[PDB]
Amino acid sequence: MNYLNNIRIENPLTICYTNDVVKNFTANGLLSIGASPAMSEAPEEAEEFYKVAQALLINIGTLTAQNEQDIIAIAQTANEAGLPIVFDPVAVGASTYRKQFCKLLLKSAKVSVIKGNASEILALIDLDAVTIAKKAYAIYKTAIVITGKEDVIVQGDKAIVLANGSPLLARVTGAGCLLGGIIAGFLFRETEPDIEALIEAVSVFNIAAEVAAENENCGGPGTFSPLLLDTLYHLNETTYQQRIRIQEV
Amino acid sequence: MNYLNNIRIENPLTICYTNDVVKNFTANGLLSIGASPAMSEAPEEAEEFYKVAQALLINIGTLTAQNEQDIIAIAQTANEAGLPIVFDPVAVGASTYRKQFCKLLLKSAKVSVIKGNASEILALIDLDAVTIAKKAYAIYKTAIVITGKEDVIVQGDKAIVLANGSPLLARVTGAGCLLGGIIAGFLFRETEPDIEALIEAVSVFNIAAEVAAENENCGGPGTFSPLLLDTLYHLNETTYQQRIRIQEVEEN
Amino acid sequence: MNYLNNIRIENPLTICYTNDVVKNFTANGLLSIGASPAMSEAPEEAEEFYKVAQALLINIGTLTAQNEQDIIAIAQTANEAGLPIVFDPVAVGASTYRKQFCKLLLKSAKVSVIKGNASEILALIDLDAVTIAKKAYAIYKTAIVITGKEDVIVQGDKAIVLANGSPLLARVTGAGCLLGGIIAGFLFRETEPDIEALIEAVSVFNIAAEVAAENENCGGPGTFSPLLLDTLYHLNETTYQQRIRIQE
Ligand SMILES: Cc1ncsc1CCO
Ligand SMILES: Cc1ncsc1CCO
Ligand SMILES: Cc1ncsc1CCO
Ligand SMILES: [Mg+2]
Ligand SMILES: [Mg+2]
Ligand SMILES: [Mg+2]
């Protein structure tokens, strides 16, 4: 825990353009680790907000025509402002609508992290999550995080596999959508983030999940979600170091 | 608990076009019973989503001009794909805006379940809940579920009255809006669902509400809502069978 | 606890045009105190709804071009109907977009309460929270509530400072955005509310927060949120009277 300490003290302004199902949970997750979430969606204020922000999350979970042109416009505003973009191509494999939009976005702007599941990342570039992540990294030259049973991170010349979390995370809507926001909270305006910042963001989230699911008062997916926020708020270096399970490839 | 066991194993894709106050809760409810919710609202992807989905929920709780034309278009796309629609005419009796919209929708598309309170269903058709449900069934030839102190379901040649749930359920926003999603999770792509699927859906919800409200850790409407999700996640056959209360059944 | 008793019995219909991060939490907080929330955003039903409503909340937390004209239109419809408006100029200091919009809104319609933090209310008008609140009152001739470490209320010829609540509230998104909706719930269709109603609304919220944070089962910001809703639901006169901390 190096980056988390800085999030708690500096309260980084983390702009979220995310889906309607997960806005509240995203904002709450960010507040629990000390970040300052802002769900600004008006392109008319992007320039002034982005000047002082630390990152931008773009998540297309509920993409519609109302969002398309605005997302492209704000991504260009972010690039111009040097504001790092975390991009979550939610369910891109499920429609030609989403595929065509994600291709247009990644042809129009440079993003700093692409986060998804194996199937989503595979649809972007078209078996192993590591192989998929490496192929995507070669195409976009942008950090890749593939979430799954084990999580994969590829940045620069390094690929890492992480093994933390809980099954109850799959049964909470926008767990993974919140993870995209947490990653944005760890960037501190670095458009080419150190792999160590990405490893800490994913590990903080998954170790908090693991600890929450062990709490005596966790009785299922409903009670888990408040206990995850509490555990993120309290997470300390001892717990982190005892629990982290990482290995290189 | 025949259908709930199948939801947990098959993980049915359940598309929800629902109101902004209850999206998250609705998705979490569906996940807790094993379904796979998707809040897709773009008509441009409805054809590809609906081919593989098991039902669609349409709920007009926060209806605005931005939604009107899109709802009509996706209902038609559902009808063309054979995808069952669960329609929740939220607060239809409260404005001419909502009345006119709901009338237009039901003239444009065939829905598979209409779910509402007695006042909502009465406003649609222009009396006890059973009489209102039967009149609505005669007009739309579509399953009707009327929620209330007792719940009423009319489908095919039967009318049933059910008696489960909790007072805390009225103090949680989108409890009922979640019920419309749960129902959609029980349809398995049947455009004329068996009444037994509707009975199980309403009973699973109300029994889970009852048991959550009895939990020692339930301290009010705030702690109830996480407990309801847990109870839906854990609900078993023994608890279902011990608790279910059918009040009366009429045939034909 | 005069007004809260009446909310529980009368179940006032409280229209909320609020931001997409806090809609569910706002509706739940209102339901917990006995109010009847309705998140109606269609100008086409504003006239019928507002006739029977007790107040309207306007909160610009996620303001976009899709909202601008509609907000102006429904604020005018509220004025015509005699429906009191609570206005929360969320982050107004953060962009010229929001500054321009809030200026236009307050030139187009008369609101009944303006609620914000000190930096928001200062950006609206252009040292301490009391001074800012008095200057805003002199400009808009409208009750002002400034939230902070201590809360400030200015209405008519009185200014009050309150000292209740919990740090945990700042770590729960739309706590403050809920307070706007709770204030609306205490208006009972009074376009010039008594300062006592505003003091009660803010005190109920803050005392509930303080009691929730002391619960043995409150383990942080995540468990706090459900416990705040429970504590609003159960809050009684005895606890209110024991806990209230008011001055000037
Ligand atoms: C976090 C956030 N972003 C826009 S609105 C909102 C809730 C607090 O005002
Ligand atoms: C359930 C759902 N539907 C669109 S976005 C979302 C949350 C998980 O991505
Ligand atoms: C409180 C509320 N307002 C609009 S929709 C909704 C939930 C179901 O009416
Ligand atoms: Mg994803
Ligand atoms: Mg209904
Ligand atoms: Mg404010």
Residues in B closer than 8 angstroms to C31, CB to CB, are 171-173, 221
Would you call A42 and C97 a contact, using CB atoms and an 8 Å cutoff?
A: yes
Residues of C with CB under 8 A from a CB of B: 20, 23-24, 27-28, 31-32, 37-42, 44-45, 48-49, 66, 217, 225-234
Question: What's the C186 CA to ligand 3 centre distance in angstroms?
Answer: 20
Question: Could you tell me the resolution of this structure in angstroms?
Answer: 1.9
> What are φ and ψ of residue A38, in 5° steps?
-140, 120
Give burial (CB, 10 Å; 0-12/13-18/19+) of B214.
Answer: exposed
Q: Which residues contact C20 (CB under 8 A, 6 or more apart)?
A: A20, A23, A39, B20, C61, C62
3-state DSSP assignment of residue C53:
coil
State the pairing for strand pair C13-17/C36-38. parallel
Residues of A with CB under 8 A from a CB of B: 19-22, 24-25, 61-66, 91, 94-98, 171-174, 217, 219-223, 225-226
3-state DSSP assignment of residue A120:
helix
> What are φ and ψ of residue B37, in 5° steps?
-75, 145
The two three-digit tokens of residue B234, written as one number: 């854990």
Residue of C39, C70, C234, C235 best to disrupt the B interface, most CBs of B under 10 A: C39
Would you call C221 and A228 a contact, using CB atoms and an 8 Å cutoff?
A: no
Ligand nearest to the CA of B92: 5
Would you call B41 and A62 a contact, using CB atoms and an 8 Å cutoff?
A: yes
3-state DSSP assignment of residue A208:
helix
Residue A88's DSSP bridge partners are A59
In Å, what is the CA distance from C213 to each residue of A236, B5, C207? Answer: 21, 40, 10
The two three-digit tokens of residue B44, written as one number: 């441009």
Domain C1-248: which CATH number of 1.10.10.60, 2.40.160.20, 3.40.1190.20, 3.40.50.620 = 3.40.1190.20
The answer to whether B10 touches B51, Cβ cutoff 8 Å, is no
The two three-digit tokens of residue C173, written as one number: 């998104």
Distance of alpha carbon C49 from alpha carbon B121, whole angstroms: 19
Residues in C closer than 8 angstroms to A14, CB to CB, are none
| Tokens 């949680």, located at residue | B172
- Secondary structure element (H or E) that encloses residue B102, with its range: helix B96-108
Q: Which residues contact C103 (CB under 8 A, 6 or more apart)?
A: none
In Å, what is the CA distance from A99 to each residue of A41, A60, A95, B44? Answer: 22, 11, 6, 12
Q: How many CA atoms lie within 13 A of A179 on its CB side?
A: 31
- For the CA of C91, the closest atom of ligand 1 is 9
State the pairing for strand pair C55-59/C13-17. parallel
Residue type, B192: E
Query: What's the DSSP call for residue A155?
Result: E
- Secondary structure element (H or E) that encloses residue A166, with its range: none
Which of A20, A28, A49 is opposite residue C172, by nearest beta carbon? A28
Largest CA-CA distance found in chain A, in angstroms, rounded: 49
Residue A86's DSSP bridge partners are A57, A113
- For the CA of C16, the closest atom of ligand 3 is 3
The two three-digit tokens of residue B217, written as one number: 């850790």
Q: Is C73 in the pocket of ligand 3 (CB under 6 A)?
A: no
The answer to whether A13 touches A187, Cβ cutoff 8 Å, is no
Handedness of CA B2, B8, B14, B19 (dihedral sign): positive
Any residues with Cβ below 6 Å from ligand 1, and which?
A 27, 37-39; C 19, 21-22, 61-62, 90, 173-174, 177
Kindly report the number of other CB atoms within 10 A of residue A179's CB atom.
26
3-state DSSP assignment of residue B252:
coil
Please give the angle made by the CA atoms of A54, C178 and C72, to the nearest 5 degrees: 85
The answer to whether A58 touches A210, Cβ cutoff 8 Å, is no
The answer to whether C182 touches C205, Cβ cutoff 8 Å, is yes
Binding residues of C for substrate: 39, 174
Note the residue count of chain A. 249
Distance of alpha carbon B204 from alpha carbon C185, whole angstroms: 34
Residue type, B5: N
- Secondary structure element (H or E) that encloses residue A241, with its range: helix A237-243
Residue C147's DSSP bridge partners are C117
Q: Which residues contact B150 (CB under 8 A, 6 or more apart)?
A: B129, B161, B162, B163, B247
Handedness of CA C202, C207, C210, C216 (dihedral sign): negative
Residue C143's DSSP bridge partners are C113
3-state DSSP assignment of residue A171:
helix
Please spell the DSSP secondary structure of B171-221, one letter per residue.
Answer: GSTTHHHHHHHHHHHT-TT-SS--HHHHHHHHHHHHHHHHHHHHSTT--SH
Distance of alpha carbon C223 from alpha carbon A32, whole angstroms: 11
Query: What's the DSSP call for residue C133?
Result: H
Which of C21, C64, C221 is opposite residue A233, by nearest beta carbon? C221
Buried-state track B121-150, b at ≥16 Cβ within 10 A, e below 16: bbbbeeeebbebbbbbbeebebbbbbbeeb
**Phi-psi region at C17: left, alpha or beta (left = phi > 0; alpha = psi -120 to 50):** beta
3-state DSSP assignment of residue B36:
strand
Which fold is adopted by the domain B1-252? UDP-N-acetylmuramoyl-L-alanine:D-glutamate ligase (3.40.1190)
Breaks (C-N over 2.5 A) in chain A follow: 126
| Tokens 């034309």, located at residue | B69
Give burial (CB, 10 Å; 0-12/13-18/19+) of A215.
Answer: middle
Q: Is B177 in the pocket of ligand 3 (CB under 6 A)?
A: yes
Terminal CA-to-CA distance of chain A, rounded, Å?
22
The two three-digit tokens of residue C201, written as one number: 């609304």
Which segments of chain A are extended strands (E)? Answer: 13-17, 36-38, 55-59, 85-88, 113-117, 143-147, 151-155, 158-162, 246-248
The answer to whether A13 touches A48, Cβ cutoff 8 Å, is no
Cα–Cα nearest to C209, from C248, C182, C247: C182
Report long-range pairs for C133-140 (Cβ below 8 Å, ≥24 apart).
C133/C159, C134/C159, C140/C106, C140/C111, C140/C114
Residue B15's DSSP bridge partners are B38, B56
> What are φ and ψ of residue C48, in 5° steps?
-70, -45
Residues in A closer than 8 angstroms to C22, CB to CB, are 24
Cα–Cα nearest to A189, from A101, A105, A84, A109: A84
Domain A1-249: which CATH number of 3.30.420.40, 3.40.1190.20, 2.60.120.10, 2.60.40.3880 = 3.40.1190.20
State the pairing for strand pair A143-147/A113-117. parallel
State the pairing for strand pair A151-155/C13-17. unpaired
The four Cα atoms C211, C214, C218, C222 give a dihedral, to 10 degrees, of 60
Q: Is C94 in the pocket of ligand 3 (CB under 6 A)?
A: no
For chain A, how big is the Rg over CA atoms in Å?
17
Residue of C20, C21, C66, C215 best to disrupt the A interface, most CBs of A under 10 A: C21
Distance of alpha carbon A147 from alpha carbon A114, whole angstroms: 11
Cα–Cα nearest to A170, from A161, A181, A178: A178
Q: Which residues contact C127 (CB under 8 A, 6 or more apart)?
A: none
Give me the residue spans of the domains in chain C. 1-248
Terminal CA-to-CA distance of chain C, rounded, Å?
20
Pocket test for ligand 3, best of C32, C39, C49 (most atoms within 8 A of CB): C39
Give burial (CB, 10 Å; 0-12/13-18/19+) of A6.
Answer: middle
Residues less than 5 Å from ion ligand 4, measured at CB? A 88, 90, 116
> What are φ and ψ of residue B111, in 5° steps?
-105, 165
Runs of H (alpha helix) within A41-128: 46-52, 65-81, 96-108, 118-125
Q: Is A29 in the pocket of ligand 2 (CB under 6 A)?
A: no
Query: What's the DSSP call for residue C111?
Result: -
Experimental method: X-ray
The answer to whether C193 touches C155, Cβ cutoff 8 Å, is yes
